[PDB]
Amino acid sequence: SEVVVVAKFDYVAQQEQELDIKKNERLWLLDDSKSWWRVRNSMNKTGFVPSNYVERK
């Protein structure tokens, strides 16, 4: 992308869709305009949707 971020802390991925990162590692942020929530639907699929497209019931 056009946005580089730096890991503040290590992160151990907990799922296949997550990424292991080390403190001080530089990464591409794929679209700064997009924060995601991990959600599960009524057909038992888990994935990501933009946080601003959903709201807490």
CB of 44 to a copy of itself, least distance (A): 9
Q: Is 2 in the site for a copy of itself (CB under 8 A)?
A: no
Interaction residues for a copy of itself, span 24-53 (CB under 8 A): 25-31, 34-42, 45-53
Whether the Cβ atoms of residue 20 and residue 11 lie closer than 8 Å to each other: yes
CA–CA distance, 13 with 15 (Å, rounded to integer): 6
CA–CA distance, 57 with 55 (Å, rounded to integer): 6
Q: Which residues bind a copy of itself (CB under 8 A)?
A: 1, 3-9, 11, 13, 17-19, 21, 25-31, 34-42, 45-57
